[PDB]
Amino acid sequence: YISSVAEMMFDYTACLVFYIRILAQWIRVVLMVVTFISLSHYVSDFDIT
Amino acid sequence: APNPYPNGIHFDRVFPTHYDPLAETNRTKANLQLIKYAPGNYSTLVVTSEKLPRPCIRTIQNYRRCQM
Numbered sequence: 001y002i003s004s005v006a007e008m009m010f011d012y013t014a015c016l017v018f019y020i021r022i023l024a025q026w027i028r029v030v031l032m033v034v035t036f037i038s039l040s041h042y043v044s045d046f047d048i049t
Numbered sequence: 050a051p052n053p054y055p056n057g058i059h060f061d062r063v064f065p066t067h068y069d070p071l072a073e074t075n076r077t078k079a080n081l082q083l084i085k086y087a088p089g090n091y092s093t094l095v096v097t098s099e100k101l102p103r104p105c106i107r108t109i110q111n112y113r114r115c116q117m
Contacts, residue, residue: 044063048081 052076058087
């Protein structure tokens with residue numbers, strides 16, 4: 001479009017998407033930590049009498 | 050054996066478990082690294098008395114008899 005204000009909104013999204021492609025991958029690190037903690041919780045609380 | 054009566058007394062080993070006897074139906078077994086429960090799973094509160102020695106009793110009976 002010839003409107004710079006209209007393109008300004010689409011460029012604000014492309015720059016946001018540009019950072020989300022990177023930042024949203026840290027949810028994978030959160031999944032790895034949570035899964036590792038749940039295993040440590042099961043082993044630490046395992047039965048021994 | 051029935052579930053022991055709820056007793057909040059416990060002793061931690063590794064970390065504070067915040068044991069609540071009313072949070073579960075059956076009391077979970079005590080693990081060595083987790084908790085030790087209070088003594089007397091099946092016990093009540095009574096009042097008892099020691100028995101005085103036999104020679105001490107005989108002198109009390111002799112005093113009462115000599116008194117009356």
